[PDB]
Amino acid sequence: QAVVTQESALTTSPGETVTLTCRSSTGAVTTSNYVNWVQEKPDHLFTGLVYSTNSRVPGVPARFSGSLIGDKAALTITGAQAEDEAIYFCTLWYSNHWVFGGGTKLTVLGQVQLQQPGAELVKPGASVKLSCKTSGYTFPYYWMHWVNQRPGRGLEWIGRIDPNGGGTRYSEKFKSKATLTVDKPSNTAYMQLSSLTSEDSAVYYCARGKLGQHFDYWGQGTALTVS
């Protein structure tokens, strides 16, 4: 599997410009990798910033911009603000799966809603169905991705579902673990995990997508603990 590499840490000062980069171990990053940039703030708060290389997510401050610089993708912050101190992840599409970079911790010197329960404790060998209740957009016209993050580990794409017909795609790691469904009348996406083990303990995120536009809005995550 490809490895996506980002600077581990970078420092900027308020009002300066800083550029983060995102490299592919397979070769040059291209627009066919549909690179997306997401921002993590404390307490698992994810915000989509840029999708498909250079499109800014509506509502995101205009000082964020995405581009390709030679071999790699780049996120530039033009006039860093104090609140931009955060972890920035890129993710790349490799024909049939998403791979997240390891994230850059940026130090700054000095309507759409996806709703998830905060936490749930479950027993091993059981199954659990996690919910992602949406609002502020026409739910059938967008896919829903699911992503997890084990403690101290990186982000892993689980899969996605298209509510128009229920078509799914799963990562290799989750292809026999997760079942995605939707309930259109309640505009809710579901992820069921079966045969739970302690290694399933993680925060599970839902994130919106569709062809050409992925990970622009995120749920707050459900911290699932398997005893």
Ligand SMILES: O=C(O)Cc1ccc(O)c([N+](=O)[O-])c1
């Ligand atoms: O948006 C694109 O063209 C990339 C893409 C294409 C097909 C997919 O199934 C998919 N996904 O996320 O599972 C992503």
